[PDB]
Ligand binder design. Sequence first.
Ligand SMILES: CCCOc1ccc(C[C@@H](Cc2ccccc2)C(=O)O)cc1CNC(=O)c1ccc(N2CCCCC2)cc1
Lengths: 259, 265
Amino acid sequence: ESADLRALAKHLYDSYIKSFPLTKAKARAILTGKTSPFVIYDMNSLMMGEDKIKFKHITPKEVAIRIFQGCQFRSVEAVQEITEYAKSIPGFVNLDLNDQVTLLKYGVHEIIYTMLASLMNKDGVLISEGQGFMTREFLKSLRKPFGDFMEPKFEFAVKFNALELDDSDLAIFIAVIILSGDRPGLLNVKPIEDIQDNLLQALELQLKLNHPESSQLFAKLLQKMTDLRQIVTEHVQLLQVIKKTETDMSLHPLLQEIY
Amino acid sequence: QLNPESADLRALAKHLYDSYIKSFPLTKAKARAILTGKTTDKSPFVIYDMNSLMMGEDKIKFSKEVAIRIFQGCQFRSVEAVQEITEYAKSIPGFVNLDLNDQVTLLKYGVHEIIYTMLASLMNKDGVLISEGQGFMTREFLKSLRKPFGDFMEPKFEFAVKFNALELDDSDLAIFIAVIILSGDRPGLLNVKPIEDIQDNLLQALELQLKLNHPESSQLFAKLLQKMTDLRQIVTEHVQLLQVIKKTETDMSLHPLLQEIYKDL
Ligand SMILES: CCCOc1ccc(C[C@@H](Cc2ccccc2)C(=O)O)cc1CNC(=O)c1ccc(N2CCCCC2)cc1
């Protein structure tokens, strides 16, 4: 029965490679130098960044605000990649359509930040297909409340990254996050937990075969789930604060609809 | 079931379960026995309203304001729970050998998550055993308490009903709360290495324990670990729900120990 576990792993991996253009293996090569990305470390470099390379996340205003909005544009984009990926998880599409919607609704944020760590090191984050590298300090230098917008993700990133997981490990971890039976509103919890259970086994073997020397990596990874939700909860808090305050956030009526 | 390594992990499970029974007067096995009302001597007095509360003062061993009285009651029992857990902690191989500051940090962030883990052993969907099992206060009575007290316990009942679904027994919990205490990612830890080394070992013990005790319960280990996020959540809500209390109830004192644990949490 350990055959069906390997098949599911490879399947998730293959699908993950197809759904996500910028993998961790690739991002890592770019980040460590052993491949170069345009570097954004201040206003002028940001400015030139937009002119030189056409960062779609920066279209036609305070910089802190356009950077924040760019983050949302990219997030929206990411949500589609994740949604497509989810469909390849054996059993997902056979679930009640409302539950599928529910799972993605509460799961994409956790996945977003999980995958974002793949593009981050203690010094910055890769943006627009890795074409650029936005400095951690520059982001942390934005005026309140934008300055501490990304920092919480960086702190998580540093920790998550010390586990040294690779694309094949993440593919399965990602699927496990999606099949969470404790999401509010689910109408049929059983099949969801039964699939996650099949995914957890697959993940456990993967980690043991891929990291035989890393003791209890499975437990440690599952524990990171706590850090993820705290990151999402906290993110949701700041998001409303920016909405309750900030008067220069309004976008075209249709754009606001899109997000 | 074979190798010397497994043997070492079973020895650890036994040591931890033994210390657990020695440190906690009311185990889950005892709590369940009282709750399933099977016996004729373990019968608890049920408080489900004012007149009952009124009569419980005479029945069970055990400020004139219903809501606050019950609240001061939980605080005292909570302070006492901190003492039992602190005593259990000392028995965890390696804990007393860590830097003293880290010992404090680990207890500071770990006692509440553990308090609520264990509190579930005393709960079922209708209420919670109190005063060493002599009494039983229903969920509805608690929920009918003046605001903002009327909903301080509800989220703990919700957690308990789900967590109890795992059907863990005391021997499993002893290792699980040990794992909770030895968390290397607690804010402010000085030496994270020695703590992780200890937790990894405890995690191996827990993993084997759950496999030998619940062979038919697939992935119980992972499911139990994911529960640690429900605990964090329960603690956070509580802390915030508490800050609201002291602002509307300037006349309600919070015990110093609890206040120190929550401070800069
Ligand atoms: C009946 C529901 C209460 O159950 C909880 C709930 C929470 C906690 C721990 C809390 C305590 C707390 C709450 C608010 C601010 C600081 C501390 C915690 O986690 O700190 C124990 C307990 C355990 N409580 C008891 O055993 C208990 C004991 C006595 C009591 N009574 C008040 C005195 C007269 C008789 C009735 C009520 C309850």
